[PDB]
């Protein structure tokens, strides 16, 4: 249960090959979360790929009215 990161040494948390969103930031791309306590590398986001070609286009057929808040 001893881990070595760029920031220093971590005691009490186990490294996991999985990836999630950062909850408790530690540093150097390493975050921690509770589920016991685990540590992992934060995931930037959901990967996506676009079907780009020389003569294809995508056109919307529906819309949505959205409301957002800003404090």
């Amino acid at each position: 249960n001893v881990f070595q990161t760029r920031a220093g040494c971590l005691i009490g948390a186990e490294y996991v090959n999985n990836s999630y969103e950062c909850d408790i930031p530690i540093g150097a791309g390493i975050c921690a979360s509770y589920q016991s306590i685990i540590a992992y590398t934060m995931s930037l986001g959901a990967e996506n790929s676009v079907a780009y070609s020389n003569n294809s286009i995508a056109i919307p057929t529906n819309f949505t009215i959205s409301v957002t808040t800003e404090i």
Binding site: A7, G27, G29, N48, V50, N54, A58
Partner: protein, 314 residues
């Protein structure tokens, strides 16, 4: 544009005192300045991380460029990531890193940034792929693919020039764009003062820290600057006065450093907000504001990472 500065932290007792123990005992009656200093420094550090995340993390998807890099005569090899290099960085990014450049831990530390350079490069690559393959629609909803010449026709239609102007002079415009990209690469390579701002930030921070650590060796009117020498030499009643003067001087210096750090952090945060606005407006869309995204009528822009900053190609 600079974005973030170096996250620093300071150990109170080891700087204010030495390896002696009774110096801390003398300090214990002087108040709780250490708490204020720690709170301010953690505030600055979390503000730096917030600045970086706000500037770069603006897309909830990580797009990948198509394997075939043909865009109707337009050449993007100079800005797209190069798999040959192990770090997966564009040649411009490598040039920027190479163009921008001790270890005395006397209580002074440097906290690592939360986001590694690889993650920032990944964000920039995703932004480039999105703005190439999907125009600007990826910034306001689901990404929709559009052929690049059609996107250029749209952008010309934006500034008040009909589409036939592009559609009749496609190859000439592509040649001009490629030549411009090459000229930018060469000019940035051959200019030493082009990257003045980021080097200035680094120099300011390093020089301030060096001044702080150098000021420790001042007498401040005492008989000697070595507290261990003072304790082993004089009657403790008057060595107490000597140490009081030394501690007051060093605390004043530390307060000055903290205030300078706060002011610099505020300025850097303002610059980061400006950079975030530029990324939101000039990159993810076309702006009609004059001179906001370059000299002349604006067409588009591309981002690139840099040590403690970002570089926009308008």
């Amino acid at each position: 544009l600079p974005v973030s500065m170096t996250k620093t932290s300071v150990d109170c007792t080891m700087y204010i005192c030495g390896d002696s123990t009774e110096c801390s005992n003398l300090l214990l009656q002087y108040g709780s300045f250490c708490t204020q200093l720690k709170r301010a420094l953690t505030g600055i550090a979390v503000e730096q991380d917030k600045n970086t995340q706000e500037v770069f993390a603006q897309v909830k998807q990580i797009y990948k460029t198509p394997p075939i890099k043909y865009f109707g005569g337009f050449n993007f090899s100079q800005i797209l990531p190069d798999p040959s290099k192990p770090s997966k960085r564009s040649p411009i990014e490598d040039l920027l890193f190479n163009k921008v450049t001790a270890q005395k831990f006397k209580g002074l530390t440097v906290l690592p940034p939360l986001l590694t350079d690889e993650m920032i490069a990944q964000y920039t690559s995703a932004l480039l792929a999105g703005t190439i393959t999907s125009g600007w629609t990826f910034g306001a909803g689901p990404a929709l693919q559009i052929p690049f010449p059609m996107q250029m026709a749209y952008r010309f239609n934006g500034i008040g020039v009909t589409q036939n102007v592009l559609y009749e002079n496609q190859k000439l415009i592509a040649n001009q764009f490629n030549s411009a990209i090459g000229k930018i690469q060469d000019s940035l390579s051959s200019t030493p003062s082009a990257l003045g701002k980021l080097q200035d930030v680094v120099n300011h921070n390093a020089q301030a820290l060096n001044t702080l650590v150098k000021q420790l060796s001042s007498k401040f009117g005492a008989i000697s600057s070595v507290l261990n020498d003072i304790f082993s030499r004089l009657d403790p009643p008057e060595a107490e006065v000597q140490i009081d003067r030394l501690i007051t001087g060093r605390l004043q210096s530390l307060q000055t450093y903290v205030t300078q750090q706060l002011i610099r952090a505020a300025e850097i945060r303002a610059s980061a907000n400006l950079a975030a606005t530029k990324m939101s407006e000039c990159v993810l869309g076309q702006s009609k504001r004059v001179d906001f995204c370059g000299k002349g009528y604006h067409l588009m822009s591309f981002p690139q990472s840099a040590p403690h900053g970002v570089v926009f190609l308008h």
